[PDB]
């Protein structure tokens, strides 16, 4: 059976390793076809004719929300792992997830933005910081946090491991998993 | 791996019969995923913001194909079903599937003479459209670009629904794009 788990938070706050290592632990020991869409998938593809603005945001976000609605349909689960900043776009895209049914599983990837800022590994913090890159999430640019995320992983001083496995976890505490 | 499988052809030329068909077998005799897109599936969804413009007109072909490519990514096998009836609009479609290697694009000519297309005529379109309440309709007041040469053709007419999709299985064969049974 098919849903949507979607990651949130800021870049370098390890989503796409978290994607990565959910759907391998899930096919591994539950073996279900999983998909998983992040910026190589969709922001040279799909998404192409988008860039950071807040408009440009929205529709990046409004896409992706249909096409892992189509891999849940799909009876896949779609593993989506885009900032998605804005609060509005995550609630919306749970609601054409909701509306008879299939399961939206949002996930906090959650770091203090020092955390993120510290890791850096292809130095967008450091270039935010100076103003190369503008409009950067939690530097010049907003990130408001889920409240009530089904999941809410504190992703720091965290094996990759304990995190998928809270995830898994909450999974099977809601019934989507087989044996 | 998986691959697309892009049918074209006029309306009421077969297409979402055959499609429907083709992921019945596939799935059933084949144990392999594979999966629609169509306008019930993608209209009013993640292309509910496109018009008629014949830019909005591409972008709907272009996004169409790059989901059905993320289904090929993925290992199912996607199938679309869209007149598409401009040819360099499955040139784009065609294209980014081609982009180590790419995934394979296979374009599925549903073929019938306009005149088997308007006999059949389910929902009236063609009837509509000659009248000229529905505007800009292929093979009536707009072109159907037939494909040059597809991978298949099926003269989808005087054949048995099954053994069209059975043409397009047996091609799939050619290829090792599937698992035996
Ligand atoms: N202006 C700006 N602000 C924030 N992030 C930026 C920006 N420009 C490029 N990048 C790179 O894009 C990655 C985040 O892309 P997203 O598709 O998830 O953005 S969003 O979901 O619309 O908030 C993010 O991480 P990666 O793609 O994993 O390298 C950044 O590297
Ligand atoms: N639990 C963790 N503890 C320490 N470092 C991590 C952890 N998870 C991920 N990282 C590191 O954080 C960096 C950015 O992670 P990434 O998954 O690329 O972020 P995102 O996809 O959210 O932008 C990576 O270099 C990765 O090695
Ligand atoms: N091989 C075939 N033999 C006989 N009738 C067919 C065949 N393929 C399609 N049809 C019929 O033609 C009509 C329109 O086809 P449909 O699949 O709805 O067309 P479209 O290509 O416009 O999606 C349907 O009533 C369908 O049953
Ligand atoms: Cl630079
Ligand atoms: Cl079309």
New interface residues.
Partial sequence: RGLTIWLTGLSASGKSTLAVELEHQLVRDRRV?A?R?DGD?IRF??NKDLGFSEADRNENIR?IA??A???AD?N?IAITSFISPYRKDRDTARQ?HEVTGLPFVEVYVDVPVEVAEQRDPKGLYKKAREGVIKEFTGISAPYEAPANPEVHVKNYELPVQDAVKQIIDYLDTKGYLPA
């Fill in positions: 076809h998909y869409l998938n593809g799909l896409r249909e096409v609605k189509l891999f799909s896949s054409l």
